[PDB]
Amino acid sequence: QEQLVAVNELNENLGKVLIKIARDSIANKLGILKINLEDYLSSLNDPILNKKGLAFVTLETYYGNSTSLRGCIGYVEAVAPLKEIVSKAAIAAAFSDPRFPPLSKGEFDNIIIEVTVLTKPQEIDVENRWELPKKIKVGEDGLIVEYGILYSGLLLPQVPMEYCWDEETFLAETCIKAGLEPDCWLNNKVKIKKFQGIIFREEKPKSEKILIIKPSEVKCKKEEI
């Protein structure tokens, strides 16, 4: 809205760009790609890239039929222009993860990059809380239930779907996560935000084709072999 990115704005080509931004940022810090990252980032003039959101980047070592976590970093404290938060996260995924050595030039070629974009959580202003279940959608919306610093509950978009919940159960379970009663969502004093997310990932290192993974395509665990 006020320069905030919406998930429906992120298509396969934008995911293609975010992935290349992450790729080049790392390549630039590894010393592989010769560029001025800052000027490079400001040259990407697609307005979408500059809308704000939250982002995470995880690097997985590529194998025939499996992958291995290689580094993960994400920022959820404050939204910032996509291209910037993604460039920053990519770099951190490669060099800041406390669990691995920094990425080496030798590894860069065998890593698959995954970029997750989350929208800025936003308050659901409905003065008829019983109509609250209608203003959200299981499989698309993440939730945040708050009531003063002491009570805060957060659920990612996928959770409700993989556990096969309906909209109300979803709000109840988040309330329980916040330390509140199952029906805390009907209480005007309890603030409720929603947000969305999306995932882009190379199916192979530097591949042209990328996989778009949506929280709404997750299978209810009860239907898993």
Q: Is 197 exposed, middle or buried (0-12, 13-18, 19+ CB in 10 A)?
A: buried
What CATH number is given to the structural domain containing 158? 3.30.1490.150
Q: How many domains does the chain have?
A: 2
Q: Are residues 146 and 129 in the same domain?
A: yes
92 lies in the same domain as 64: yes
Same domain, 36 and 135: no
φ, ψ at 96 (rounded to 5°): -100, -20
Claim to verify: residue 203 and residue 153 sit in the same structural domain: no
Same domain, 62 and 159: no
Both 37 and 107 in one domain: the answer is yes
Report the alpha-carbon angle 142-147-151, nearest 5: 80
3-class DSSP state of 121: coil
Which CATH number do you get for residue 88? 3.30.700.20
Pair 162, 90 in one domain: no
CA gap 180, 190 in Å, rounded: 9
| 40 and 106 inside one domain | yes
Domain span holding position 1: 1-120+197-225
* Cβ(85)–Cβ(54) below 8 Å: yes
Question: What is the DSSP secondary structure assignment for residue 101, as one 8-state letter?
Answer: P
On whether both 83 and 3 belong to a single domain, the answer is: yes
In a shared domain, residues 111 and 137 = no
